[PDB]
Design a protein around this ligand. Structure first.
Ligand code: 3PE
Ligand code: 3PE
Ligand code: SF4
Lengths: 315, 62, 68, 167, 53, 107, 182, 117, 188, 93
């Protein structure tokens, strides 16, 4: 009955939270192994049996490591941002689609836009709390990157949204029931990888945390426990985008293991980029954001709007 | 091959004298490369391949 | 799939002494390979060489068991 | 209950807003206010469509300017006062217990959410935003949208005219 | 990317670098004087240390 | 990262060669005023041959990966133009000078 | 000086245990605190993050260790650039007077438990530049060194052997077990 | 919704509890004058270090807002397309995007991102 | 123990340091640590100091109210808003519970050294005696608080509000010693 | 009373916003932020009315599009003003 409904809804949310957290913490190893073999390294195979408990080992180190809090009175404000970031990276999951009702969450695309937007405030205030020009430059560069890409991200969404005829994500499954949707929108997939990669701040768009240009960007002044939360937040983010890529382009077959095979392959693909590409410049990226992607997205918008008008004409 | 841009004597090799053609097949090639990232695809497949080479790590201290 | 590779696994795993005697070896050395007893050390160590691998892997050592 | 608790949280944050003077502390205060107001309007609406909208425009993009230019930082970080927090907690709680006391219904709005419409209403069985946003595009009330977009175009012509004072 | 040694004192506006003062000398190991005190054969490794790549 | 690691694999082979002749990974003392300090061990010639044999493959792998890549090209190209006259009067040399256009070289 | 036992002596002896403390604990509190120390040391031992200071000549070996021949992340070691996130500092190369305050500052900005490896002779005792007007004779005079890796430079094997020795030191550290006595 | 609200509150509470817990699990150390300085690669931080606010980043974010609002205008096209009159929905939407392109291409010839500084 | 105690948060109430008798019936004469150490070595090198007590005290006695006010001036704790007040520890019965609980809970050293024994210490006055030798007998110059403490507490300076003015606030005007007759007035 | 139970909360917040708009602040940023809070309240009054109305609801965008433009203009003149004088501080006024 009714309270059966609510109890399960909370169990599912809680159950998903532990899984996504343990997955991303455990996924970190797969980055370290996989990148280890892109390079001709062997990757972690030392601790436990073949480095399986490597990420648990990492967490124990961090939580034991003290919290080298910055200048005297910043305690809270420096302690806020990691919470307010890991929260977004997790809670963004709850809109993800199921056939087995977790929610009746409509406007899921809008909610995606919103959560992906809120990352700016976390990084920016984090740098501001740190109060170190290195951290501050990182935040500004991080802010500019995310804010710029959201513009293209929105219009890109709309192409799919029109092609499915609603904002409810679930209809991606019904429209993909015959033939996958990548093979229709191939260029969008490459662009969407880049947009997703920009959001999660991975390379080639690695300006926010980065290395060798800023020490760690905003992350530079973060002690252990805060750092662990930021680091987990980023990987919860990289997984979610991998899921969103899977549900849009590659079948949305939530009740089929092949969907989870596809999750791993896409998250692998993110790493596959990590070990291959070099980094962009500031300005060249902004050209790529406004002068290249926005034009691209508008054309497809004007292309598919006509197509659906023609489609509506036919039926 | 496209012609050079500076005539070279021996004992040297200019590494940029090659001209960027304006022939239509040549521009469309480059355009298609940018529109579908062929060069990235070449590099992408390289690293996939090079997973399949056995790592050269010595299992120290054994 | 298993092109005469699972066979090789069977050789090393079984003649190790079973599940326990394959896992403890793996658990300790972080790898399990096949060679020949080049010579037994004076101090319990055992040396193994196999030209099948390359120079990094050519020769290796199983330290004395009492060193846990 | 959620509705009047949400009044209470907005009241408390409003008292926070009028006290705080550090620009980040104020800008932080706006951020919370926006979530609360989005929640509240959503409850009394037919759906949360407009709530998601103004969230991503007002908060998501436009408060970025305010925080960013108010990154003046005062040159120093907050001296947080656990006292206004405790008063904030204190004022919240007995407002919250009063919320538990107050009349369940009469203390609620009267607006008609999609659920609080009658069953017979044949119109209500459409997509929740279809019939609401219809005449934003259908004539003869759609040209005003054209005025909006050109207004925004002109807004950019203005910004580059003000933000381009010799540098 | 700073070789571990180099220390650039940079003055930036926006993000561009206007004045870039490099402070070479964070490594200087008085090797000219030492080379003087030792013998030619002894002095030889000094040069291999220099430009160690 | 990938270029650096792939090449630093091959850097190990070359250092081993220094180790074979001189006895030190780096920082040999092998060149001395009267010629090299010491003769070479037999077979080092051949090992050099195979190493040179494979180096074309290794260098080309990274070369094809990275020379053409757009990010790298735009990331480096047209950075810090060094005109010929400005190069000389500042006392340049090496591939910097040789890159700017000057046909000079000490060899 | 001692020497390894001989074949038959090894035969008599049992397994050397895993936790270096042993398993002779008397009471529940002792036995429990022994395990928690073991877990802590296991965490701090398995994952260790150098800072990559690497001033000079020695640094090249500090890179070859990262290279794929004697892989170091294999052991759970990663080069975090930011000292706030780095757990260990491999001071390598010479410490000139201009650098001395910098090294000090970097060291104590790093949070503890912090261990320093003094790689190379230049850091160990000033190395080959010991009688120089500009060099800190050793790095013991600026920071507390934990492990010394002799060499000029140390061969990469030597360096990561020392890393393992640091892991052993990280393994046997007694913090909870002996707080109980404190 | 409030099902969503409660779940977020629960997560946030669990999140802060975890970080609260780590704050006690991590050993303390006696504070140090220098351990709490801004990180400037190991050389003393300069004066206040508060960056100049004479820059363009607000200008880019203002372009964001214009396009961010314009995005808002075009969001509902998905649903109304089944209901609205087709001429008006067709032309009205088309001129939106067309004006955007022309604004963009006109603005490339302006080239405003290639500032002199 | 001394300055960290008077600086740490738990020692403070909301913004109201509680002091025994408002900290206005206490005489303290702290000394700087290095000058104590330098005394130790100098008396270790000399064996003729053997078998001699030494009252180690600073140059100028002080009143705890003078110190804490000066401390808060140094820390910029008194400009407009941070709002320092001094209670009577006897009036408020909450400070003791903080000490008792803080002791009972912390396994290691209690947070900020809040254990009651520290509280009794601040209450106790500093009774020197003549004849008992001193640092001057040990040939040790004594850096005063006026030279040492400002830099000492510089890390804990804070409260640079956006609402108010900073920087131009004068250097913290030093405290004022307590003389023998003035002490006899204090104790009446 | 209808307004006292329904339109009261919007009033109390709106008046508090204005008073903060006419208070004392080191620069004008607190003012702009003050009127910004007022806009959110302005939206609040506007929406509860547009909710009285079956489909007139959509007018939110019109108000929102206009309101953000005021804020942008607000930040525009301020930021140009720092750049002019090297500061936009109320002491300059
Ligand atoms: C009901 C519950 C009953 C509890 C049963 C016991 C659960 C714990 C099982 C694992 C205990 C391992 C004990 C033996 C050991 O010390 O193994 C060490 C292992 C390898 O570490 P290492 O020394 O680096 O050797 C690497 C070899 N390639 O490294 C480790 O395994 C240590 C890390 C183990 C992580 C688990 C921590 C203990 C509590 C369980 C987690 C909750
Ligand atoms: C649990 C894991 C604790 C990790 C954090 C930690 O290191 O706490 C250490 C502390 C005792 O450690 P220790 O510093 O050596 O002794 C007190 C010094 N006054 O731990 C404790 O004092 C309490 C341990 C309770 C068991
Ligand atoms: S110790 Fe040797 S290898 Fe290290 S920096 Fe000095 S000379 Fe170079």
């Amino acid at each position: 009955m009714f309270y059966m409904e609510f109890i399960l809804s909370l169990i599912g949310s809680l159950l998903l939270i532990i899984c996504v957290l343990v997955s991303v913490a455990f996924l970190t190893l797969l980055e370290r192994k996989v990148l280890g073999y892109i390079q001709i390294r062997k990757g972690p195979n030392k601790v436990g049996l073949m480095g399986i408990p490597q990420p648990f080992c990492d967490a124990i180190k961090l939580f034991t490591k003290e919290q080298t809090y910055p200048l005297l009175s910043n305690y809270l404000s420096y302690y806020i941002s990691p919470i307010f970031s890991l929260f977004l990276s997790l809670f963004v999951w709850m809109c993800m689609p199921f056939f087995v009702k977790l929610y009746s969450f409509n406007l899921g695309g809008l909610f995606f836009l919103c959560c992906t937007s809120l990352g700016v405030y976390t990084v920016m205030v984090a740098g501001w709390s740190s109060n170190s020009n290195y951290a501050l430059l990182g935040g500004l560069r991080a802010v500019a990157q995310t804010i710029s890409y959201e513009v293209s991200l929105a219009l890109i969404l709309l192409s799919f949204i029109f092609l499915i005829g609603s904002y409810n994500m679930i209809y991606f499954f019904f429209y993909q029931v015959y033939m996958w949707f990548l093979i229709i929108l191939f260029p969008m997939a490459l662009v969407w990888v880049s947009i997703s990669l920009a959001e999660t701040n991975r390379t080639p768009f690695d300006f926010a945390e980065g290395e060798s240009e800023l020490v760690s960007g905003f992350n530079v002044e973060y002690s252990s426990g805060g750092f662990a939360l930021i680091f987990m937040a980023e990987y919860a983010s990289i997984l979610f985008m991998s899921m969103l890529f899977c549900v849009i382009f590659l079948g949305c077959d939530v009740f089929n293991l092949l969907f989870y095979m596809k999750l791993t392959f896409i998250s692998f693909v993110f790493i596959w980029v990590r070990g291959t590409l070099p980094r962009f410049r500031y300005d060249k990226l902004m050209y790529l954001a406004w002068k290249c992607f926005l034009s691209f997205s508008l054309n497809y918008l004007l292309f598919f709007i006509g197509f659906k008008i023609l489609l509506f004409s036919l039926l | 091959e496209p012609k050079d841009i500076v005539e070279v004597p021996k004992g040297y090799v200019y590494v940029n004298n090659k001209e960027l053609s304006m022939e239509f097949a040549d521009i469309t090639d480059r355009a298609a490369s940018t529109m579908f990232f062929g060069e990235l695809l070449r590099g992408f497949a390289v690293t996939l391949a090079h997973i399949f080479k056995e790592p050269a790590t010595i299992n120290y201290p054994f | 799939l298993g092109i005469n590779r699972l066979t090789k696994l069977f050789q090393m795993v079984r003649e190790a002494g079973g599940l326990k005697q394959a896992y403890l070896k793996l658990y300790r050395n972080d790898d399990l390979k096949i060679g020949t007893l080049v010579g037994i050390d004076k101090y319990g160590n055992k040396y193994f060489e196999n030209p099948y691998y390359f120079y990094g892997r050519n020769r290796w050592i199983e330290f004395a068991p009492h060193v846990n | 209950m959620i509705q009047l608790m949400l009044y209470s949280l907005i009241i408390t944050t409003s008292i926070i807003f009028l006290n705080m003077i550090h620009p980040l502390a104020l800008g932080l205060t706006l951020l919370i206010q926006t979530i609360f107001v989005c929640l509240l309007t959503g409850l009394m609406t037919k759906s949360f469509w407009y709530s998601y909208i103004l969230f991503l425009i007002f908060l998501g993009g436009m408060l970025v300017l305010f925080i960013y230019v108010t990154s003046l930082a005062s040159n120093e970080m907050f001296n947080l006062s656990m006292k206004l927090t405790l008063f904030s907690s204190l004022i919240l709680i007995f407002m919250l217990i009063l919320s538990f006391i107050m009349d369940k219904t009469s203390s609620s709005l009267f607006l008609m959410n999609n659920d609080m419409q009658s069953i017979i209403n044949m119109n209500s069985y459409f997509m929740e935003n279809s019939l609401s946003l219809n005449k934003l595009y259908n004539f003869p009330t759609n040209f005003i949208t054209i005025l909006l977009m050109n207004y925004l175009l002109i807004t950019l012509i203005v910004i580059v005219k003000i933000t381009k004072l010799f540098k | 990317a700073a070789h571990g040694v180099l220390r650039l004192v940079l003055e930036l506006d926006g993000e561009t670098v206007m004045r870039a003062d490099p402070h070479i000398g964070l490594l200087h190991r008085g090797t000219e004087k030492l080379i003087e005190y030792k013998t030619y054969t002894q002095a030889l490794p000094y040069f291999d240390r220099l430009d160690y790549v | 990262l990938t270029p650096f690691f792939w090449l630093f694999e091959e850097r190990e082979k070359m250092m081993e060669f220094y180790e074979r002749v001189s006895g030190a990974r780096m920082h040999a003392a092998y060149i001395r005023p009267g010629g090299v300090s010491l003769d070479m061990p037999l077979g080092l010639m051949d090992d050099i041959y195979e190493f040179a044999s494979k180096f074309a493959e290794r260098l080309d792998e990274v070369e094809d990966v990275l020379t053409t890549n757009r990010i790298w090209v735009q990331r480096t190209e047209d950075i810090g133009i060094v005109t010929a006259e400005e190069a000389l009067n500042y006392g340049f040399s090496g591939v910097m000078l040789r890159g700017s256009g000057i046909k000079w070289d000490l060899r | 000086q001692q020497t390894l036992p001989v074949a038959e002596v090894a035969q008599n002896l049992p397994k050397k245990g895993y936790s270096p403390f042993g398993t002779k604990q008397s009471s529940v509190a002792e036995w429990s605190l022994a395990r928690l120390d073991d877990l802590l040391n296991w965490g701090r031992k398995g994952s260790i993050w150098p800072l990559t200071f690497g001033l000079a000549c020695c640094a090249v070996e500090m890179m070859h260790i990262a290279a794929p021949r004697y892989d170091m992340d294999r052991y759970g070691v990663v080069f975090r650039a930011s000292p706030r996130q780095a757990d260990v500092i491999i001071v390598a190369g010479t410490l000139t007077n201009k650098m001395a305050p910098a090294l000090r500052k970097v060291y104590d900005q790093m949070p503890e438990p912090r261990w320093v490896i003094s790689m190379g002779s230049c850091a160990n005792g000033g190395g080959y530049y010991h009688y120089s007007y500009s060099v800190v004779r050793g790095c013991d005079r600026i920071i507390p060194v934990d492990i010394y890796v002799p060499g000029c430079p140390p061969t990469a094997e030597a360096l990561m052997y020392g890393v393992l020795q640091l892991q052993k030191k990280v393994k046997r550290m007694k913090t909870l077990q002996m707080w109980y006595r404190k | 919704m409030f099902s969503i609200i409660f779940i977020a509150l629960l997560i946030l509470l669990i999140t802060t509890i975890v970080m609260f817990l780590a704050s006690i699990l991590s050993k303390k150390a006696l504070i140090d004058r220098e351990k709490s300085s801004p990180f400037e690669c190991g050389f003393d931080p300069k004066s206040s270090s508060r960056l100049p606010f004479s820059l363009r980043f607000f200008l880019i974010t203002i372009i964001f807002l214009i396009f961010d609002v314009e995005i808002a205008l075009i969001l509902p096209m998905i649903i109304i397309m089944k209901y609205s009159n087709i001429m008006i929905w067709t032309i009205t939407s088309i001129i939106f995007i067309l004006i955007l392109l022309i604004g963009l291409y006109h603005e490339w010839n302006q080239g405003m991102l290639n500032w002199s500084n | 123990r001394f300055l960290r105690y008077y600086a740490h948060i738990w020692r403070r109430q909301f913004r109201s340091m509680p002091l025994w008798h408002k900290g206005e019936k206490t005489v303290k004469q702290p000394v700087y640590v290095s000058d104590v150490a330098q005394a130790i070595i100098n008396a270790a090198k000399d064996p003729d100091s053997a078998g001699r007590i030494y009252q180690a005290v600073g140059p100028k006695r002080y009143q705890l109210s003078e110190l804490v006010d000066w401390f808060h001036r140094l820390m910029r704790k008194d400009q407009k808003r941070w709002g320092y007040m001094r209670y009577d520890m006897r009036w408020d019965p909450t400070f003791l519970l903080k000490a008792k609980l803080n002791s009972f809970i912390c396994p290691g050293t209690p947070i900020g050294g809040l254990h009651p024994a520290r509280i009794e210490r601040e209450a106790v006055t500093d009774k020197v005696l003549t004849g008992v030798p001193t640092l001057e007998d040990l040939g040790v110059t004594l850096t005063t608080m006026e030279q040492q403490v400002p830099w000492e507490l510089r890390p804990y300076r804070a409260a640079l509000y956006y609402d108010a003015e900073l920087g131009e606030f004068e250097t913290p005007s030093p405290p004022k010693c307590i003389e023998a007759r003035d002490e006899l007035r204090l104790f009446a | 009373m209808i307004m006292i139970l329904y339109w009261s909360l919007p009033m109390i917040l709106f008046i508090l916003g204005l008073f903060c708009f006419v208070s004392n602040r080191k620069h004008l940023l607190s003012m702009l932020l003050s009127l910004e809070f007022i806009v959110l309240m302005l939206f609040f009054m506007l929406f509860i009315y547009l909710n009285m109305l079956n489909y007139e609801s959509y007018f939110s965008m019109m108000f929102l599009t206009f309101s953000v433009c005021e804020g942008a203009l607000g930040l525009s003149i301020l930021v140009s003003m720092i750049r002019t004088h090297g500061n936009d501080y109320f002491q300059s006024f």
